Structures are given as C-alpha cells and as structure tokens.
C-alpha cells in the first residue's frame, strides 16, 4: 500500500517486540527525553536555588551526593508556576541554577506516563482483551500527578513539587506533615489501608495458591516445573485453597469464585491508592487532616493533652525549622 | 456517555482552577481571598506595620540578601518579598492602586496606602484558605478557636475529586465501549483466541 | 507493554508471597537495630563536608534540621519523666516561624 | 569527600561474589545435555 498506510500498519502492529501504537509515538520521545535529562542531571547538575533565596541546594553525585542524598532539585520559588523551558533562560548556566531540568523532566514524564496508560488501553484492544488494566495503572499515575503537578498548582510553585530523589522525597513528606497533618487525613489513612491491605492480600493470595499446587514434580526439582506455559488446566486446586481459608476464618469470609477473588485483588489497592492521590490533590488546596489540638478540656478549662496534641508538637518542630531562611512574616500561607 | 464523561472531567479540573485563582467571577468579597491573595496580603500587612514604625521598606535587606519587603521578579517588576515572591502574578482591587508601570511603586507605598487597604489586607491575611477537615481555621498546627474553611477550598477540593473520578469513568466506559463494539467485552473466545493466531514475539 | 512478563503461574504466585513477606522481615531487622539506637542516622562524609563548608547543602542536611526541630519541640511533653524545661531562647527555629 | 576507604572493595565484592556464583551456575546449566 501507500507509505502512510504501511507506516500506520507498523505503528499499530501486534507483532513488534515492544508495542508502539499511537500513544507510543508520544510516549517514546517524551520518556526518552525525561530519562536522558534525569540521568545527566542526577550525575552532573550544579546546585539549584530551589527556594528562590539564592541558597543553592546540591543534588548531583559529582557535586557531593550519594545515591541516597542525591536528587534532581525542583525549580526556583522565584519562577513559581511560570513555564521555564531552556529557551526562556539566557544561558544553560542560568537554566541550571534555577532548576530548569526539574520542569523538563516532570513535564515529559507526566506526558509520557499518561501515554503509557493510554498505550495499555490500546494494546488490550489490539489483542482482543478486556480494557481495564489501564484503569488499575491510573492509581499510581494519579499519585505522580498529585505530587509533581497538582500540589505545585495549589501552592503556587513547582518549588513545592516532590524532588526527584530519595532524601528529597522524605523532605517533601515531612514538610507535608507539618503543613497539612496528612497522617490525620482520612484519605491518607485509606491510602495506608490500600497499601498495607494490598501487601497483605498479595501475600495471602500468593500463599494460598502456592499451598494448593497440584503434585506434578519430584522432591528433587522445583515445583515450578509442574506448570507449563499455556496449559489449559488450572495448576492449583482452588477448592482446596477455599476449603483451607474458609476454615481459617469462616466459610463465608472466603472467596470460592476466582473472578470475584481477582477483582477484589485489583480493586482494594487501586481504590485505596486513588484516595491516597486525592488526599495529596485536595491538601493541595489546604483542606487538611483532622485538627484536634486542645479538643479535650477539663472542668476549669485546663487543656488535657491527647496523642493528637503530641503529634502537634512534632509538627511544630518540622514547621519552625523547614526552609529556615525563607520566611519573613509570621504565617506560612503557602 | 464516555465522551461526555471526559468532557465533564476536563470542565471539573477547569472549575477547580477557576475558583482557586480567579477573583473576578469568584469575587473575594463573597468567596474569601485566594491563596495567592492572602499571601500577598500578609506581606502588605507587615510592610504597612513596619513602615509605620519607621522602616524604609525599599532598602530593607532581608536575611538572604533579597529585600525583606520588596524585591524584583525574574523580569524586573517590583514585587512583595519573602515566600510570596511566587505569587507576584496576583492582581486584586485593594493592591492595584499601589502598582505603577514597573510594579509596586515605592512612592505610592510611602505616601498613598489608605486605611481601607490596610483593613482589606488584614482581613484577607487572616482568612487565608487554610484549615482542617473538621473546619478549624488556620495552619495545621493552629489550636482550636476559629471555625473556618474557605469556600474556595471546599469548591476546589470537591471538584478535583469529582473531575478525577470522572476521568476514571471516561477511561472505564471508553475502553468498554470499544470492547463491546468490537465484540469481546465479555472475554476471549476460547476457540478464536487472537494471540494464538499471531507469530511469536521471539 | 513492559518488556517482561510472567510465563509460569507457580512462580508468579510464589513471587507474590516472597515480595511483601521479605519486605516486612527486612523492616523488622532495622527496628531491632533501633532498639539499641543503632541507627542509619548520618552520612559521616556529608557531615565532615558540611561542617567545614557553610555553602554545602543537600536534602540530607535539610532533613536533619527537621529532625532537630522535632526533637526539641516534642520532647518536653512526649517524655514527661525527663522533666525537660527548654527556655524559649534555646528552641531551634528558622526566621519568623 | 571523606568516605570510608573500605567502601569501594566492600561494594565491589558485594556485587562480584554472588554475581559470579550465579554466572557459574547458569553457564554449567546451559552446558548440560
């Protein structure tokens, strides 16, 4: 056929070792750009004035960091939410001082990861699958949007986006607790239920299927050779697994329907992480965790502290120390 | 339905940003100050206070070397200093009388700040859109006393949540509509499994 | 999509046991160390550089300042048996806050 | 930076010793039968 038809046929081909697709034509260049800039910056970028106070923070390995302390540092508070591409800087030296790499990386990453999700829809369609793996992926994806884009928008600066680094991540978490009391927010609590529960049900399902593998091997070989890729029969006895778990708790607390079971495995962590993402995305607009500071009062009016008041003392320590040279006025309003 | 769900998700995200930043069709008289507004109002409040005490706020150097009250934006405009440097795009009727061609005007700051501007800045600084889910107004470490969460926070948070779930609903129904139109929304035909007719990847 | 995929269902489900179970076991070992205050608190090379060079700053040194605030501001009420009295002037605080 | 001078050989043997263990076992599996 014509060259455009052949090109379209290759792009959407189900026979490519890695599927490309139309989402892929955006995903591949954007993710390569973000990856290459990230790696180069992580190794070699000079210090970045994250808080706009001419106090540059060193993030790269060559400038004194190890793997745990290193980061790509968010762009300057003086930029705020302004779009700061390379061509807006007078020079690369200026671009680097002000944290230009961070914006390039997170914007290419967020676009590429959004296309990764669309690409999961697209291949499922080409293969004749049902379509909702991409909906499961929307939960981690929404969480990345929350910490790299929505929280900066609500606070008015990409300098408050999560840094691209291990210790920078912890910095973001501690400051977030000081300013939003996230631990006391029910959407973060649902998030914890989601990931604790996800890990629990992962171990549970793994242990139950492994416990009921049908004997197909000898004592001196891995039991994994008892399963052959593409065999039609199930490789474990779900009736035995349910017979075990239903007696562990009680019969009606156990799944006998594999489709119901696996739907539950999908839904529990996905919904929980959706609420995690929505916690960050709504604390982005300063609707914060529950505040019970001085909620308990005695007959005279003395404050009777609760554990919430002890949390408050810890939060205060974080608040008064963070960004120790950046505040001139008494209230931290963003 | 899936097309409309995508449209409504987009509109919800837009409305979230409208109520968070815009103070024209969401007048601050009715909705409270925006986040940027209240932060600018704090800087205005202590500029007024310290200048009344005798400070020359144009030449006051802060701890970092930047002006404690006034500094330049990255393109040179005179703007409020401190963390509110991020909010210099803010515009509001209580502040614009102090703005000249190059930004905030020192002569207007020295001579022309009216009592109603001091009042409005104090009001907005102390009704910043920060507060707890049980409606304790202020920063997260503030004690109980003030029953306040800004309408801007209620409207922004609610509509982000709804916009997000409507994006999820769009993906759900768009993917399902495609699968149903093509005839495999109920699963793979065992006797006609498409991958079994494809060449191996390796 | 991802480049690799499971092909053995028995391996897949063993891996689902292995990953969270091993993670919790590792976290338990760290807490046994913290029982003795045997922390991963510092990077000595970072502290030596920062002590001599007041322009050197990383996210690691920023988080220690947060920790110092947490300790000083929470300890008097969180550890009442110590009878801590920290005068206002000794409390660590940045500017204004 | 004043790093621990044993960190380099600690890291090198940490990688090399178990990696070569696995490579030895892999290659002698391929060469069987």
């Amino acid at each position: 056929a014509n060259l455009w038809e052949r090109f379209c046929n290759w792009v959407t081909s189900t026979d490519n070792r890695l599927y490309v697709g139309w989402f892929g034509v955006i995903m591949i260049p954007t993710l390569l750009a973000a990856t290459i800039c990230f790696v180069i910056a992580f190794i070699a970028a000079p210090p970045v004035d994250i808080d706009g106070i001419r106090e540059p923070v060193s993030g790269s390995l060559l400038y004194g960091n190890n793997i745990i302390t290193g980061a790509v540092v968010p762009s300057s508070n003086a930029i705020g939410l302004h779009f700061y591409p390379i061509w807006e800087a007078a020079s690369l030296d200026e671009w680097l001082y002000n944290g230009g790499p961070y914006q390039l990386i997170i914007f290419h990453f967020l676009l590429g990861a959004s296309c990764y999700m669309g690409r999961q829809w697209e291949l499922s369609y080409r293969l004749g699958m049902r379509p909702w793996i991409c909906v499961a992926y929307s939960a981690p994806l929404a969480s990345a949007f929350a910490v790299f884009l929505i929280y900066p928008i609500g606070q008015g600066s990409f300098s408050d986006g999560m840094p691209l680094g291990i210790s920078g991540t912890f910095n973001f978490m501690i400051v977030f607790q000081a300013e939003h009391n996230i631990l006391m927010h029910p959407f973060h609590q649902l998030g914890v239920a989601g990931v604790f529960g996800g890990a629990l049900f992962c171990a549970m399902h793994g242990s139950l299927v492994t416990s009921s593998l049908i004997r197909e091997t000898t004592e001196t070989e891995s039991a994994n050779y008892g399963y052959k890729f593409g065999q039609e029969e199930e490789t474990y006895n779900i009736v035995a697994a349910h017979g075990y778990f239903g007696r562990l708790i009680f019969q009606y607390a156990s799944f006998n329907n594999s489709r119901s079971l696996h739907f539950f495995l999908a839904a529990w962590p996905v919904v929980g992480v959706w609420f995690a993402a929505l916690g960050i995305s709504t604390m982005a607009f300063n609707l914060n965790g529950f505040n019970f500071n001085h909620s308990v009062i005695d007959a005279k009016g003395n404050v009777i502290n609760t554990w919430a008041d002890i949390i408050n003392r810890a939060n205060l320590g974080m608040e008064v120390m963070h960004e120790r040279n950046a505040h001139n006025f008494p209230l931290d309003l963003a | 339905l899936s097309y409309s769900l995508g449209a409504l998700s987009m509109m919800g995200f837009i409305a979230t940003c409208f109520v968070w930043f815009n103070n024209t069709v969401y007048p601050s008289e009715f909705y409270g100050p925006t986040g940027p507004e209240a932060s600018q109002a704090q800087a205005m409040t202590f500029l007024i206070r310290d200048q009344k005490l005798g400070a020359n706020v144009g030449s006051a150097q802060g701890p970092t070397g930047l002006g404690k009250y006034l500094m330049r934006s990255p393109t040179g405009e005179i703007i409020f200093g401190g963390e509110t440097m991020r909010f210099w795009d803010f515009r509001g009727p209580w502040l614009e009388p102090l703005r000249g061609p190059n930004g905030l005007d020192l002569n207007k700051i020295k001579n022309d700040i009216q009592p109603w501007q001091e009042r409005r800045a104090a009001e907005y600084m102390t009704h910043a859109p920060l507060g707890s889910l049980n409606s304790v107004g202020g920063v997260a470490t503030e004690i109980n006393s003030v029953n306040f969460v800004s309408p801007r926070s209620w409207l922004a948070t609610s509509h982000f949540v709804l916009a997000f779930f409507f994006l999820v609903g769009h993906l759900w129904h768009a993917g399902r509509a495609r699968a149903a139109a093509a005839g495999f929304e109920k699963g793979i035909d065992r006797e006609s499994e498409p991958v079994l007719s494809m060449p191996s990847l390796d | 999509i991802f480049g690799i995929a499971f092909s053995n269902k028995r391996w897949l489900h063993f891996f689902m046991l292995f990953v969270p179970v091993t993670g919790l076991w590792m976290s338990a070992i760290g807490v046994v160390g913290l029982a003795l205050n045997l922390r991963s608190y510092d990077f000595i090379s970072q502290e030596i550089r920062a002590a001599e060079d007041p322009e050197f700053e990383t996210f690691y040194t920023k988080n220690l300042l947060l920790n110092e605030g947490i300790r000083a501001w929470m300890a008097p009420q969180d550890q009442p048996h110590e009878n801590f009295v920290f005068p206002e002037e000794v409390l660590p605080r940045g500017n204004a806050l | 930076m004043e790093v621990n001078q044993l960190g380099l050989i600690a890291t090198a043997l940490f990688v090399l010793v178990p990696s070569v263990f696995l490579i030895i076992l892999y290659v002698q599996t391929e060469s069987q039968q």
Binding site: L18, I43 | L201, D202 | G3, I4, S7 | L8, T11
Partner: peptide, 30 residues
C-alpha cells in the same frame, strides 16, 4: 571513586534490562 561506583552499578542494571528483555528465554507453549 564513589561516583564511578554508583554510575557503574546503574549502568550494569540498564544493561541487565536490555538482556532480560531482548535476550530472554522465550516463552513457549508446551
């Protein structure tokens, strides 16, 4: 030497990805 070590380990991991993907043991229906 630290930076070389960190970047070396990272480079080995990326090479491992390449082999794990393009030179995997091929899945075969038995």
């Amino acid at each position: 030497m630290e930076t070389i070590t960190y970047v070396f380990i990272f480079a080995c991991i990326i090479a491992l990805f390449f082999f794990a993907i393009f030179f995997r043991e091929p899945p075969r229906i038995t």
